[PDB]
Amino acid sequence: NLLSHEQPISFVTLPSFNDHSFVNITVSAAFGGLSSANLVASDTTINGFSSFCVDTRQFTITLFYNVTNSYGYVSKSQDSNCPFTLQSVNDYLSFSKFCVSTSLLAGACTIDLFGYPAFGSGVKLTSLYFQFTKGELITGTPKPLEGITDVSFMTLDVCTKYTIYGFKGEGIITLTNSSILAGVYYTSDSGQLLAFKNVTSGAVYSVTPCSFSEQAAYVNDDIVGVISSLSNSTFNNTRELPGFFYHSNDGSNCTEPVLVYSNIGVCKSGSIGYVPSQYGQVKIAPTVTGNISIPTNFSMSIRT
Amino acid sequence: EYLQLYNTPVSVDCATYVCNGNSRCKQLLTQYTAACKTIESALQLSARLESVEVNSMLTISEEALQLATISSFNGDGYNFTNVLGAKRSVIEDLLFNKVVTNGLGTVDEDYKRCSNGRSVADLVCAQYYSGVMVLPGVVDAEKLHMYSASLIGGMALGGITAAAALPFSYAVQARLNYLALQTDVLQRNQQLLAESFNSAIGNITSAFESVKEAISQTSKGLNTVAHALTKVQEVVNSQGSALNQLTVQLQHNFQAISSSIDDIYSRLDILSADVQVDRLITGRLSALNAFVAQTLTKYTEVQASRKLAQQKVNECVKSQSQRYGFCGGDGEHIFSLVQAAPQGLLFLHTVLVPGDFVNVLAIAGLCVNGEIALTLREPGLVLFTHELQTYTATEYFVSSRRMFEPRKPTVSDF
Amino acid sequence: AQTLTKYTEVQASRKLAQQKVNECVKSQSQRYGFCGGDGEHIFSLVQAAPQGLLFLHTVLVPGDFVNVLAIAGLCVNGEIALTLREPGLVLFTHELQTYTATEYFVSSRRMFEPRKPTVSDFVQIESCVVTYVNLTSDQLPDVIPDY
Amino acid sequence: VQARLNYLALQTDVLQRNQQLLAESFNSAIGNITSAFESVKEAISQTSKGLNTVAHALTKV
Amino acid sequence: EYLQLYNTPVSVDCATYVCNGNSRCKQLLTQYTAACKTIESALQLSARLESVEVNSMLTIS
Amino acid sequence: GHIPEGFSFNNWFLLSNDSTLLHGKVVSNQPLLVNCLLAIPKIYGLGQFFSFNHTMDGVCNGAAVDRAPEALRFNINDTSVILAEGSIVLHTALGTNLSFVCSNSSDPHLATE
Ligand SMILES: *[C@H]1O[C@H](CO)[C@@H](O[C@@H]2O[C@H](CO)[C@@H](O[C@@H]3O[C@H](CO[C@H]4O[C@H](CO)[C@@H](O)[C@H](O)[C@@H]4O)[C@@H](O)[C@H](O[C@H]4O[C@H](CO)[C@@H](O)[C@H](O)[C@@H]4O[C@H]4O[C@H](CO)[C@@H](O)[C@H](O)[C@@H]4O)[C@@H]3O)[C@H](O)[C@H]2NC(C)=O)[C@H](O)[C@H]1NC(C)=O
């Protein structure tokens, strides 16, 4: 599939309006010294306080650095003891609660923020402690995203990079008229999303991967045809068979298969056909009084 | 007896299984040199070997198959109606319906249904999105039926000028002659044989539709139809086992922060995301190596059944066995029919069991004039008199030891 | 576990190779297809191969068949019924279109190797049966030279 | 080979070269298995790939 | 020649192996759907098949 | 305290804080042992206090069992019944009460469907 730079984003979540608050974090530090660069008077705030906890159903984390290095610039980096990074929290993650503080919260992960004011050993500017719970209601976001009855967006029938009730992947979303009466999402034993509801309307949508697996018939150093779930492919002829499609450059039938499996035969030209059962030589039942036949001129054969 | 001929082959696209089509994960997977080659070619080169073995032992004969399939088979007293069929037989339809109704994967599923999401994907497409394909069964139930009829009709093929089917009371008389040369032929014993077989095939066809409220422990042993139905259902249920355990190992997380690769690459930094995706790659390659080891031993378990099935077709069905118990345990063998069964053949070894024994004085030989000692030439024949209470007697007979077929001695036997 | 299961996988091939040596190479097999599938066996050669044996089972296969009317036995004078002793032999005539014929032969059922019948090939069974040829002691020596 | 033919059927009609059509049919078989041990899959047909033949023996080796 | 007829069967009480009779682990173990069914029945159904296949060939006269 | 065999299960769902099972057998820890089934006609609502430390009151079908619930299941067919201010209040152990309220506005401090 040839959508690498093109592919639409999709986001589906439990029905919401535009209910947004920024968690904006200010990190401040001062530096001095003439024989080396070193740190003084660091402070951290989230929305002007030492701690914050999210209540609105969307949020954006933004970092403001307000570093006053006399040597002209500072490079900045992050360490995560955490299943996210500050810019990745914005990339449609979902939570049941989310609180951030400059001081250690009960279950918390750490993001530690570092500056390098003169290159070599860095210095810790600030530590952010995040307490969160994997869930469905509160979702991270890049910018306040508009809507009245729902905030969700989809593109159907096109390979999309999706977040759907916290599952992520690339896939095709299609509407199905296979209505289901309980829950919000349906998963395989593979842990992979198969379908989900637009719970405001009861409609159920199904998710496929956007590259399917195929068997390529390779003969004489080229792919002469391909066996597939798909109706369309690069070869200029397609044939339909009871379990699958066969794509090739030659729609004829096959009388000289160079590959067989079961009763499916693929010819050198890339034709497909059905190959008949081998016929064994006749053996004669012992019989008493009929018109019988007795084996006469015998050749010799070596079976290896 | 049920003998499995084949195992339903399975194939994997290792990049789809390990990486869910994520490009950055495929780029890491190529660093595990030949891990994919050594999984894929082990499944493909084994699925090919099954295809050439099973399609090469299922040699049909066209001039034998035309004597069974048309139901123009001259049973001449024997009721072959349950065995032949016009498409499958009565026993073949009961045997599939007793097991393939609760079964799966013995009817070939279509992948055309699963590029389009207009219906919510079921188990056999949730596997296909996980990159694992069950191939069409190595031979279809129509080729497997034609083979079975080509063996039943092969018994009526007395000669290649095949204008009508040979009356089966003649093919059974020739099969009795290899046990003992039949002599008292103007007796009811050919009808005793026929009406006994008519009752015996009536009683196998009833067991393919009866229930365990009518089973007793001797009817559950090593060569009877309830043991064959336990063995058929063990095959049909077992075929999912390795393929389910392959698929659930995709929801293990192998110490990574999540069980999905686009989740990890969309939440960690790209340096640390590669480090956690290596534990999913290593774990999922191990889950495939464990599945290839299960799958290759499940082909090897079948191949010793196939080799035995081919021996029973050549020694019990196409010819007749002098080996005492090979075709259906204790008794004198005369023929085995074959029928198609879910992933193999069902053999109906028709063995002669004696209701009665005669007791006779056996005589080693004749010491004529105290001078010339006559002995029978053949160790299969016994020289006897009916008069047990004396060393010499009214009149003498020769018969086989295997069946009581008396005749007067001839100067050519001694 | 992998190494011991591979020794067990090979032992079951070696047990077959010892059977094929003893029943195809050292002797001859009456077991129909054991030595190299459908045909009549005459000998298997053996050659050494990388980790085992390559068996060259030299079978006999018929190019042609002869079609002959088989006779169950002779019902002489309507009184004494003769049947061939051996289930591997067939008594026959080339004259398919008639219930009785010019001259009679015996052969194996497995190869067409004809000979005239001999008085030592036949046994007098207790009763005659409707499938047997109706014949007389005045012409039984047309069937059995040296009767 | 004559003694090994007798176990199948006692031989009789020895006139008109009856052994030479066996011997020359073996020469032309052993001179064909020796070609499959040095030829290549460009000269394979699906009946020449079966359960009792030299291409299956080589695949198994 | 010695030929083995039978393998001494073994059975497992899956909850007792996994949980030692701790009540609150049994509760957790039920969430691994059919994990004990697919261990218990594989051992019991195979122990039963040995019982019939051996006691059916050891026919005394 | 068991639900009778042959009951329809008309709107009783097996609970998940996760994915939903489309078909098949499962063994799970569910609020399916019943202490009482307080049936109210659809033409009445009710106001009661249900305590997770006391036995539920009001006349109820079959035999009443004296246990304090661990779950309360409300089997309301038309969701017009559940949207009003104070329609559910949940009394948390910390002495905080959490009240479900619904509005026709996206701002909660204050039309047919
Ligand atoms: C979806 O995921 C959720 C997450 O909530 C899950 O919730 C879990 O539900 C279970 C019940 O199914 C709750 O489990 C209980 O745990 C308590 C103890 O935990 C306490 O302490 C921790 C502090 O470390 C607190 O955070 C927590 O709130 C609790 O205070 C046990 O007390 C409960 O056991 C009782 O019931 C058991 C049977 O279910 C009995 O075996 C046990 O003895 C207890 O019985 C009591 O009641 C009896 C009534 O007769 C009485 O007779 C006994 O004497 C006794 O009083 C139970 O194990 C667990 O809390 C929830 N998880 C969380 C986050 O709390 C949902 O169930 C889950 N949904 C599904 C279907 O998957």
Residue numbers in the entry:
A (entry chain A): 488 to 791
B (entry chain C): 792 to 877, 890 to 1217
C (entry chain A): 1096 to 1242
D (entry chain A): 975 to 1035
E (entry chain B): 792 to 852
F (entry chain C): 245 to 354, 363 to 365
Task: Share the article's original sentences.
Like other coronaviruses, PEDV makes use of a large, trimeric spike (S) glycoprotein to mediate membrane fusion and gain entry into host cells. PEDV S is a homotrimeric class I fusion protein that is processed into S1 and S2 subunits by trypsin-like host cell proteases. Carbohydrate binding by the S1 N-terminal domain is thought to keep the virus in close proximity to the host cell surface, whereas engagement of specific protein receptors by the S1-CTD is thought to initiate a series of conformational changes in the spike that ultimately result in membrane fusion and delivery of the viral genome to the cytosol. One characteristic that distinguishes the majority of alphacoronavirus spikes from their homologs in other coronavirus genera is the presence of an additional domain (D∅) at the N terminus of S1 that arose from duplication of the NTD.
To learn more about the processes that mediate PEDV entry and infection, we produced the soluble ectodomain of the PEDV spike protein from the classical CV777 strain and solved the structure of this macromolecular machine to a resolution of 3.1 Å by cryo-electron microscopy (cryo-EM). Our final model contains 1,064 amino acids per monomer, spanning Thr43 to Tyr1242. Our model encompasses 21 of the 29 N-linked glycosylation sites on each protomer of the PEDV spike, with 16 of these contained within the S1 subunit and 5 contained within the S2 subunit. The PEDV S1 subunit is almost entirely composed of β-sheets, whereas the S2 subunit is made up of a series of discontinuous α-helices that are characteristic of a class I fusion protein in the prefusion conformation. The density at Asn261 was particularly prominent and allowed us to build a branched, high-mannose glycan that was packed between the NTD and the α-helices of the S2 fusion machinery. The most dramatic difference between the structure of PEDV S and that of the previously reported alphacoronavirus NL63 S is the position of their respective D∅ domains. In NL63 S, this domain was observed tucked against S2, pointing down toward the viral membrane. However, our reconstruction of PEDV S clearly shows the corresponding density for D∅ jutting out from the apex of the trimer such that it is perpendicular to the 3-fold axis of symmetry and readily accessible to interact with its host cell attachment factor, sialic acid. The S1-CTDs of PEDV S adopt the same arrangement that has been described in the alphacoronaviruses and deltacoronaviruses, wherein the putative receptor-binding loops are tucked against the NTD of the same protomer. However, after extensive 3D classification of our PEDV CV777 data set, we were unable to observe any such conformational dynamism of the PEDV S1-CTDs in the intact PEDV S trimer.
